[PDB]
Amino acid sequence: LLELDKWASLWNWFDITNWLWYIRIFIIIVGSLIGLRIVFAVLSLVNRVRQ
Amino acid sequence: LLELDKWASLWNWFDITNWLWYIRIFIIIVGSLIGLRIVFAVLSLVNRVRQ
Amino acid sequence: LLELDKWASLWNWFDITNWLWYIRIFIIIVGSLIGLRIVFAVLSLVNRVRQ
Ligand SMILES: Nc1c2c([n+](CCCCCCCCCC[n+]3c4c(c(N)c5ccccc53)CCC4)c3ccccc13)CCC2
Ligand SMILES: Nc1c2c([n+](CCCCCCCCCC[n+]3c4c(c(N)c5ccccc53)CCC4)c3ccccc13)CCC2
Ligand SMILES: Nc1c2c([n+](CCCCCCCCCC[n+]3c4c(c(N)c5ccccc53)CCC4)c3ccccc13)CCC2
């Protein structure tokens, strides 16, 4: 079941341990990833005449 | 608050437990979604033929 | 580790708690945010008709 001992016990093989409480930092990075996309839209204007 | 007894209470309908579990995986799905969106640019090009 | 004492005790300043139960939700908000990006493609070309 869910308990303090279970969280500390998960430290045996490290793989789920790191991914369980360090994903949130990576989460913020995935946000701005959509923001940068907007500059891309100007390329559509050039897509008609091509490079 | 939350504890061993609190989580086990949701084991009968576990409706919310399904959502409160695996959320991390869902974000990963939304990570590849942003790249796929780029292909949509082709949709705009044909707007020149329509009204 | 984790315990109902750590969560409730955290309510003394509630400063980090706000960051612990608001940013998680922000992910879902960022979902629709990426879908909204598509209109930009149309808006990119519309500039040739309107300033
Ligand atoms: N030697 C091993 C063991 C185990 N693994 C499986 C993974 C065990 C670690 C993850 C445990 C996380 C528990 C929390 C997840 N969790 C949460 C919540 C619930 N309501 C949950 C309900 C049921 C289960 C988990 C829940 C609500 C919020 C979270 C191994 C895997 C690889 C190698 C060796 C392993 C299992 C036993 C031995
Ligand atoms: N898979 C994991 C999970 C979890 N954990 C525990 C995460 C706990 C985060 C809070 C730590 C900062 C506390 C700041 C609050 N806090 C405290 C105190 C003060 N005097 C403060 C003063 C000012 C501000 C805050 C203060 C005194 C005592 C606390 C893991 C830990 C390691 C590895 C894997 C983990 C949890 C779920 C999964
Ligand atoms: N017929 C039903 C009954 C009951 N249920 C249970 C109600 C749901 C309880 C969920 C517990 C949430 C606790 C959140 C604690 N928690 C956490 C974190 C924070 N940052 C927090 C900040 C503030 C407060 C709590 C916090 C960060 C991590 C946790 C049902 C549920 C679904 C369907 C039918 C149900 C009960 C009786 C009948």
Coordinates of N, CA and C and ligand atoms in Angstrom, one line a residue:
Chain A
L1 N 0.9 -1.2 0.0 CA 0.0 0.0 0.0 C 0.9 1.2 0.0
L2 N 0.3 2.4 0.1 CA 1.1 3.7 0.1 C 1.5 4.0 1.5
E3 N 2.9 4.2 1.7 CA 3.4 4.5 3.0 C 4.8 5.0 2.9
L4 N 5.3 5.7 3.9 CA 6.6 6.3 3.9 C 7.7 5.3 3.6
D5 N 7.5 4.1 4.2 CA 8.5 3.0 4.0 C 8.6 2.6 2.5
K6 N 7.5 2.7 1.8 CA 7.4 2.3 0.4 C 8.2 3.3 -0.4
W7 N 8.1 4.6 -0.1 CA 8.9 5.6 -0.9 C 10.4 5.4 -0.7
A8 N 10.8 5.2 0.5 CA 12.2 5.0 0.8 C 12.7 3.6 0.3
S9 N 11.8 2.6 0.2 CA 12.2 1.3 -0.3 C 12.5 1.3 -1.8
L10 N 11.7 2.2 -2.5 CA 11.9 2.4 -3.9 C 13.3 2.7 -4.3
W11 N 14.1 3.2 -3.4 CA 15.5 3.5 -3.6 C 16.4 2.3 -4.0
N12 N 15.9 1.1 -4.0 CA 16.7 -0.1 -4.3 C 17.2 -0.1 -5.7
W13 N 16.4 0.1 -6.7 CA 16.9 0.1 -8.1 C 17.0 1.5 -8.8
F14 N 16.8 2.6 -8.1 CA 17.0 3.9 -8.7 C 16.2 4.3 -10.0
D15 N 15.9 3.4 -10.9 CA 15.3 3.9 -12.2 C 13.9 4.6 -12.0
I16 N 12.9 3.9 -11.3 CA 11.6 4.6 -11.0 C 11.8 5.7 -10.0
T17 N 12.8 5.6 -9.1 CA 13.1 6.6 -8.1 C 13.4 8.0 -8.7
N18 N 14.3 8.1 -9.7 CA 14.6 9.3 -10.3 C 13.5 9.9 -11.1
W19 N 12.9 9.1 -11.9 CA 11.8 9.5 -12.8 C 10.5 9.9 -12.0
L20 N 10.3 9.4 -10.8 CA 9.1 9.7 -10.0 C 9.1 11.2 -9.5
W21 N 10.3 11.8 -9.1 CA 10.2 13.1 -8.5 C 11.2 14.1 -9.2
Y22 N 11.6 13.8 -10.5 CA 12.5 14.8 -11.2 C 11.8 15.1 -12.6
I23 N 10.7 14.5 -12.9 CA 10.0 14.8 -14.2 C 9.5 16.2 -14.2
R24 N 9.0 16.8 -13.1 CA 8.4 18.1 -13.0 C 9.3 19.2 -13.6
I25 N 10.6 19.0 -13.3 CA 11.6 20.0 -13.9 C 11.5 20.0 -15.4
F26 N 11.6 18.7 -15.9 CA 11.6 18.5 -17.4 C 10.2 19.0 -18.0
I27 N 9.2 19.0 -17.2 CA 7.8 19.4 -17.6 C 7.9 20.9 -18.0
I28 N 8.5 21.8 -17.2 CA 8.5 23.2 -17.5 C 9.2 23.4 -18.9
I29 N 10.3 22.7 -19.1 CA 11.0 22.8 -20.4 C 10.1 22.5 -21.6
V30 N 9.2 21.5 -21.4 CA 8.3 21.1 -22.5 C 7.2 22.2 -22.8
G31 N 7.0 23.1 -21.8 CA 6.1 24.2 -22.1 C 6.6 25.2 -23.1
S32 N 7.7 25.9 -22.8 CA 8.3 26.8 -23.8 C 8.4 26.2 -25.2
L33 N 8.6 24.9 -25.3 CA 8.8 24.3 -26.5 C 7.7 24.7 -27.5
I34 N 6.4 24.9 -27.0 CA 5.3 25.3 -27.9 C 5.4 26.8 -28.2
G35 N 5.9 27.6 -27.3 CA 6.0 29.0 -27.5 C 7.0 29.3 -28.7
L36 N 8.1 28.7 -28.7 CA 9.1 29.0 -29.8 C 8.5 28.7 -31.2
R37 N 7.6 27.8 -31.3 CA 6.9 27.4 -32.6 C 6.3 28.6 -33.3
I38 N 5.8 29.6 -32.6 CA 5.2 30.8 -33.3 C 6.1 31.5 -34.3
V39 N 7.4 31.7 -34.0 CA 8.3 32.3 -35.0 C 8.3 31.5 -36.3
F40 N 8.0 30.2 -36.2 CA 8.0 29.3 -37.4 C 6.9 29.8 -38.4
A41 N 5.8 30.3 -37.9 CA 4.7 30.7 -38.8 C 5.1 31.7 -39.9
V42 N 6.0 32.6 -39.7 CA 6.4 33.5 -40.8 C 6.9 32.7 -42.0
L43 N 7.5 31.5 -41.8 CA 8.0 30.7 -42.9 C 6.9 30.3 -43.9
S44 N 5.6 30.3 -43.3 CA 4.5 29.9 -44.2 C 4.4 30.9 -45.3
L45 N 4.6 32.2 -45.0 CA 4.6 33.3 -46.0 C 5.5 33.0 -47.2
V46 N 6.7 32.4 -46.8 CA 7.7 32.1 -47.8 C 7.4 30.8 -48.5
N47 N 6.6 29.9 -47.9 CA 6.3 28.6 -48.4 C 5.7 28.7 -49.8
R48 N 5.0 29.8 -50.2 CA 4.3 29.9 -51.5 C 5.4 30.1 -52.6
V49 N 6.3 31.0 -52.3 CA 7.4 31.3 -53.3 C 8.6 30.4 -53.1
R50 N 8.7 29.7 -52.0 CA 9.8 28.8 -51.8 C 11.1 29.6 -51.7
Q51 N 12.2 28.9 -51.2 CA 13.5 29.6 -51.1 C 14.0 29.8 -52.5
Chain B
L1 N -5.1 16.0 3.6 CA -4.0 15.1 4.0 C -4.1 13.8 3.2
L2 N -3.2 12.9 3.4 CA -3.2 11.6 2.7 C -2.3 10.6 3.4
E3 N -2.7 9.3 3.3 CA -1.9 8.2 3.9 C -2.2 6.8 3.4
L4 N -1.6 5.8 4.0 CA -1.9 4.4 3.6 C -3.4 4.1 3.6
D5 N -4.1 4.6 4.7 CA -5.5 4.4 4.8 C -6.3 5.2 3.8
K6 N -5.8 6.4 3.4 CA -6.5 7.3 2.5 C -6.5 6.7 1.1
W7 N -5.3 6.2 0.6 CA -5.2 5.7 -0.8 C -6.0 4.4 -0.9
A8 N -6.0 3.6 0.1 CA -6.7 2.3 0.1 C -8.2 2.5 0.0
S9 N -8.7 3.6 0.5 CA -10.1 3.9 0.4 C -10.6 4.0 -1.0
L10 N -9.8 4.5 -1.9 CA -10.1 4.7 -3.3 C -10.1 3.3 -4.1
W11 N -9.6 2.2 -3.4 CA -9.5 0.9 -4.1 C -10.9 0.3 -4.5
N12 N -12.0 1.0 -4.1 CA -13.3 0.4 -4.4 C -13.8 0.9 -5.8
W13 N -13.8 2.2 -6.0 CA -14.2 2.8 -7.3 C -13.0 3.2 -8.1
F14 N -11.9 3.5 -7.4 CA -10.6 3.9 -8.1 C -10.8 4.8 -9.4
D15 N -11.9 5.5 -9.5 CA -12.1 6.3 -10.7 C -11.0 7.4 -10.8
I16 N -10.9 8.2 -9.7 CA -9.9 9.3 -9.7 C -8.5 8.7 -9.6
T17 N -8.3 7.5 -9.0 CA -7.0 6.9 -8.9 C -6.4 6.7 -10.3
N18 N -7.3 6.3 -11.2 CA -6.8 6.1 -12.6 C -6.2 7.3 -13.2
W19 N -6.8 8.5 -13.0 CA -6.3 9.7 -13.5 C -5.1 10.2 -12.7
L20 N -5.2 10.1 -11.3 CA -4.1 10.6 -10.5 C -2.8 9.6 -10.7
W21 N -3.0 8.6 -11.5 CA -1.9 7.7 -11.7 C -1.6 7.7 -13.2
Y22 N -0.3 7.6 -13.5 CA 0.2 7.6 -14.9 C 0.1 9.0 -15.6
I23 N -0.1 10.1 -14.8 CA -0.2 11.4 -15.4 C 1.1 11.8 -16.1
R24 N 2.2 11.3 -15.6 CA 3.5 11.6 -16.2 C 3.6 11.1 -17.6
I25 N 3.1 9.9 -17.8 CA 3.1 9.3 -19.2 C 2.3 10.2 -20.1
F26 N 1.1 10.7 -19.7 CA 0.3 11.6 -20.5 C 1.1 12.8 -21.0
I27 N 1.9 13.4 -20.1 CA 2.7 14.6 -20.6 C 3.6 14.2 -21.7
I28 N 4.2 13.0 -21.6 CA 5.1 12.5 -22.6 C 4.4 12.5 -24.0
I29 N 3.1 12.0 -23.9 CA 2.3 11.9 -25.2 C 2.2 13.3 -25.7
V30 N 1.9 14.3 -24.8 CA 1.8 15.7 -25.3 C 3.1 16.3 -25.7
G31 N 4.3 15.6 -25.5 CA 5.6 16.1 -25.9 C 5.8 15.8 -27.4
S32 N 5.3 14.7 -28.0 CA 5.4 14.4 -29.4 C 4.3 15.1 -30.2
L33 N 3.2 15.5 -29.5 CA 2.1 16.2 -30.1 C 2.5 17.5 -30.7
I34 N 3.4 18.2 -30.1 CA 3.9 19.5 -30.6 C 4.6 19.4 -31.9
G35 N 5.4 18.3 -32.1 CA 6.1 18.2 -33.4 C 5.1 17.8 -34.5
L36 N 4.2 16.9 -34.2 CA 3.2 16.5 -35.2 C 2.4 17.7 -35.8
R37 N 2.1 18.7 -34.9 CA 1.4 19.9 -35.3 C 2.0 20.6 -36.5
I38 N 3.3 20.5 -36.7 CA 4.0 21.3 -37.7 C 3.4 20.9 -39.1
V39 N 3.1 19.6 -39.3 CA 2.6 19.1 -40.6 C 1.3 19.9 -41.0
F40 N 0.6 20.4 -40.0 CA -0.7 21.2 -40.3 C -0.4 22.4 -41.2
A41 N 0.8 22.9 -41.3 CA 1.1 24.0 -42.2 C 0.6 23.8 -43.6
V42 N 0.6 22.5 -44.1 CA 0.1 22.2 -45.4 C -1.4 22.6 -45.6
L43 N -2.1 22.6 -44.5 CA -3.5 22.9 -44.5 C -3.7 24.4 -44.9
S44 N -2.9 25.3 -44.4 CA -3.0 26.7 -44.8 C -2.7 27.0 -46.3
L45 N -1.8 26.2 -46.9 CA -1.5 26.5 -48.4 C -2.7 26.4 -49.3
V46 N -3.5 25.4 -49.2 CA -4.7 25.3 -50.1 C -5.7 26.4 -49.8
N47 N -5.6 27.2 -48.7 CA -6.6 28.2 -48.5 C -6.6 29.3 -49.6
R48 N -5.6 29.2 -50.5 CA -5.5 30.2 -51.6 C -6.4 29.8 -52.7
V49 N -6.8 28.5 -52.8 CA -7.8 28.1 -53.8 C -9.2 28.3 -53.4
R50 N -9.5 28.2 -52.1 CA -10.8 28.4 -51.6 C -11.2 29.9 -51.6
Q51 N -12.4 30.2 -51.1 CA -12.8 31.6 -51.1 C -11.8 32.6 -50.6
Chain C
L1 N 10.9 9.9 1.1 CA 9.9 9.6 2.1 C 8.7 10.4 2.0
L2 N 7.6 10.2 2.8 CA 6.4 10.9 2.7 C 5.5 10.6 3.8
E3 N 4.7 11.6 4.3 CA 3.8 11.3 5.5 C 2.7 12.4 5.6
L4 N 1.5 12.0 6.0 CA 0.4 13.0 6.2 C 0.9 14.2 7.1
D5 N 1.9 13.9 7.9 CA 2.5 15.0 8.8 C 3.2 16.0 8.0
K6 N 4.0 15.6 6.9 CA 4.8 16.5 6.1 C 3.9 17.4 5.3
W7 N 2.8 16.8 4.8 CA 1.8 17.6 3.9 C 1.1 18.6 4.7
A8 N 0.5 18.2 5.9 CA -0.2 19.1 6.7 C 0.7 20.1 7.4
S9 N 1.9 19.7 7.8 CA 2.8 20.6 8.5 C 3.2 21.7 7.5
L10 N 3.4 21.3 6.2 CA 3.7 22.3 5.1 C 2.7 23.4 5.1
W11 N 1.5 23.3 5.7 CA 0.5 24.3 5.6 C 0.9 25.5 6.5
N12 N 2.0 25.5 7.2 CA 2.4 26.6 8.1 C 2.7 27.9 7.3
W13 N 3.5 27.7 6.2 CA 3.8 28.9 5.3 C 3.0 28.8 4.0
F14 N 2.6 27.6 3.6 CA 1.8 27.4 2.4 C 2.5 27.9 1.1
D15 N 3.7 28.6 1.2 CA 4.3 29.1 0.0 C 4.7 28.0 -1.0
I16 N 5.4 27.0 -0.6 CA 5.7 25.9 -1.5 C 4.5 25.1 -1.9
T17 N 3.5 25.0 -0.9 CA 2.3 24.2 -1.2 C 1.6 24.8 -2.4
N18 N 1.6 26.1 -2.6 CA 1.0 26.7 -3.7 C 1.7 26.3 -5.0
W19 N 3.0 26.2 -4.9 CA 3.8 25.7 -6.0 C 3.7 24.2 -6.3
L20 N 3.2 23.5 -5.2 CA 3.1 22.0 -5.3 C 1.7 21.6 -5.9
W21 N 0.7 22.5 -5.8 CA -0.6 22.1 -6.3 C -1.2 23.1 -7.3
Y22 N -0.3 23.8 -8.1 CA -0.7 24.8 -9.1 C 0.0 24.5 -10.4
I23 N 1.3 24.2 -10.3 CA 2.1 24.0 -11.5 C 1.7 22.7 -12.2
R24 N 1.3 21.7 -11.4 CA 0.9 20.4 -11.9 C -0.3 20.6 -12.9
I25 N -1.3 21.4 -12.4 CA -2.5 21.8 -13.2 C -2.0 22.5 -14.5
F26 N -1.0 23.4 -14.4 CA -0.6 24.2 -15.5 C -0.3 23.3 -16.8
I27 N 0.1 22.1 -16.6 CA 0.3 21.2 -17.7 C -0.9 21.1 -18.6
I28 N -2.1 20.7 -18.0 CA -3.3 20.6 -18.8 C -3.6 21.9 -19.5
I29 N -3.4 23.1 -18.8 CA -3.6 24.4 -19.5 C -2.7 24.5 -20.7
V30 N -1.5 24.0 -20.6 CA -0.5 24.1 -21.7 C -1.0 23.2 -22.9
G31 N -1.9 22.2 -22.6 CA -2.3 21.3 -23.7 C -3.1 22.1 -24.8
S32 N -4.2 22.7 -24.4 CA -5.0 23.5 -25.4 C -4.1 24.5 -26.0
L33 N -3.1 25.0 -25.2 CA -2.2 26.1 -25.7 C -1.5 25.6 -27.0
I34 N -1.1 24.4 -27.1 CA -0.4 23.9 -28.4 C -1.4 23.8 -29.5
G35 N -2.7 23.4 -29.2 CA -3.7 23.2 -30.3 C -4.0 24.6 -30.9
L36 N -4.1 25.6 -30.0 CA -4.4 27.0 -30.4 C -3.3 27.5 -31.4
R37 N -2.1 27.0 -31.4 CA -1.0 27.4 -32.3 C -1.4 27.3 -33.7
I38 N -2.2 26.3 -34.1 CA -2.6 26.1 -35.5 C -3.2 27.3 -36.2
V39 N -4.1 28.0 -35.5 CA -4.7 29.2 -36.2 C -3.6 30.2 -36.7
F40 N -2.5 30.2 -36.1 CA -1.4 31.1 -36.5 C -1.0 30.9 -37.9
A41 N -1.1 29.6 -38.4 CA -0.7 29.4 -39.8 C -1.7 30.2 -40.7
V42 N -3.0 30.2 -40.4 CA -4.0 30.9 -41.2 C -3.7 32.4 -41.0
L43 N -3.5 32.8 -39.8 CA -3.2 34.2 -39.5 C -1.9 34.7 -40.1
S44 N -1.0 33.8 -40.4 CA 0.3 34.2 -41.0 C 0.0 34.6 -42.5
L45 N -0.8 33.9 -43.2 CA -1.1 34.2 -44.6 C -2.1 35.4 -44.7
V46 N -3.0 35.5 -43.7 CA -4.1 36.5 -43.7 C -3.5 38.0 -43.8
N47 N -2.2 38.1 -43.3 CA -1.5 39.4 -43.3 C -1.4 40.0 -44.7
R48 N -1.4 39.1 -45.7 CA -1.2 39.6 -47.1 C -2.5 40.3 -47.6
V49 N -3.6 40.1 -46.8 CA -4.9 40.8 -47.2 C -5.2 41.9 -46.2
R50 N -4.8 41.8 -44.9 CA -5.1 42.8 -43.9 C -3.8 43.1 -43.2
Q51 N -3.6 44.4 -42.8 CA -2.3 44.8 -42.1 C -2.4 44.2 -40.7
Ligands
LIG1 N1 12.1 -5.3 -6.3 C1 11.0 -4.5 -7.0 C2 9.6 -4.3 -6.4 C3 8.6 -3.6 -7.1 N2 8.9 -3.0 -8.4 C4 7.8 -2.3 -9.1 C5 8.0 -0.8 -8.9 C6 7.9 -0.4 -7.4 C7 8.4 1.0 -7.2 C8 7.2 2.0 -7.5 C9 6.3 2.1 -6.3 C10 5.5 3.5 -6.3 C11 4.3 3.5 -5.4 C12 3.5 4.8 -5.6 C13 2.6 4.6 -6.9 N3 1.2 4.6 -6.5 C14 0.6 5.9 -6.2 C15 -0.8 5.9 -5.8 C16 -1.6 4.7 -5.7 N4 -3.1 4.8 -5.3 C17 -1.0 3.4 -6.1 C18 -1.8 2.0 -6.0 C19 -1.2 0.8 -6.3 C20 0.2 0.8 -6.7 C21 1.0 2.0 -6.7 C22 0.5 3.3 -6.5 C23 -1.2 7.3 -5.6 C24 0.1 8.2 -5.8 C25 1.2 7.2 -6.2 C26 10.1 -3.1 -9.1 C27 10.5 -2.6 -10.4 C28 11.8 -2.8 -11.0 C29 12.8 -3.6 -10.4 C30 12.6 -4.1 -9.1 C31 11.3 -4.0 -8.4 C32 7.4 -3.5 -6.3 C33 7.7 -4.3 -5.0 C34 9.1 -4.8 -5.1
LIG2 N1 9.7 9.6 -5.6 C1 9.8 10.6 -4.5 C2 8.5 11.2 -3.9 C3 8.6 12.1 -2.9 N2 9.9 12.5 -2.2 C4 9.8 13.5 -1.1 C5 9.7 14.9 -1.7 C6 9.5 15.9 -0.6 C7 9.6 17.3 -1.2 C8 9.6 18.4 -0.1 C9 11.1 18.6 0.4 C10 11.2 20.1 0.8 C11 10.5 20.4 2.1 C12 10.4 22.0 2.3 C13 9.3 22.3 3.3 N3 9.9 22.9 4.5 C14 10.3 22.0 5.6 C15 10.9 22.6 6.8 C16 11.1 24.0 7.0 N4 11.8 24.6 8.2 C17 10.8 24.9 5.8 C18 11.0 26.5 5.9 C19 10.6 27.3 4.7 C20 10.0 26.7 3.6 C21 9.8 25.3 3.5 C22 10.1 24.3 4.5 C23 11.1 21.5 7.8 C24 10.7 20.2 7.1 C25 10.1 20.6 5.8 C26 11.1 12.0 -2.7 C27 12.5 12.3 -2.1 C28 13.7 11.7 -2.7 C29 13.7 10.8 -3.8 C30 12.4 10.4 -4.4 C31 11.1 11.0 -3.9 C32 7.2 12.5 -2.5 C33 6.3 11.8 -3.5 C34 7.1 11.0 -4.3
LIG3 N1 -17.7 8.2 -2.6 C1 -16.4 8.7 -2.4 C2 -15.8 9.0 -1.0 C3 -14.5 9.5 -0.9 N2 -13.6 9.7 -2.1 C4 -12.3 10.3 -1.8 C5 -12.2 11.8 -2.2 C6 -10.9 12.1 -2.9 C7 -9.7 12.2 -1.9 C8 -8.4 12.4 -2.7 C9 -7.3 12.8 -1.7 C10 -6.5 14.0 -2.2 C11 -5.6 14.5 -1.1 C12 -4.6 15.6 -1.6 C13 -3.5 15.8 -0.6 N3 -2.7 16.9 -1.1 C14 -1.5 16.6 -1.9 C15 -0.6 17.6 -2.4 C16 -0.9 19.1 -2.1 N4 0.0 20.1 -2.6 C17 -2.1 19.4 -1.2 C18 -2.4 20.9 -0.8 C19 -3.5 21.1 0.0 C20 -4.4 20.1 0.4 C21 -4.1 18.7 0.1 C22 -3.0 18.2 -0.7 C23 0.4 17.0 -3.2 C24 0.2 15.5 -3.2 C25 -1.0 15.3 -2.4 C26 -14.0 9.5 -3.4 C27 -13.3 9.8 -4.6 C28 -13.8 9.5 -5.9 C29 -15.1 9.0 -6.2 C30 -16.0 8.7 -5.1 C31 -15.5 9.0 -3.6 C32 -14.2 9.6 0.5 C33 -15.4 9.2 1.3 C34 -16.4 8.8 0.3

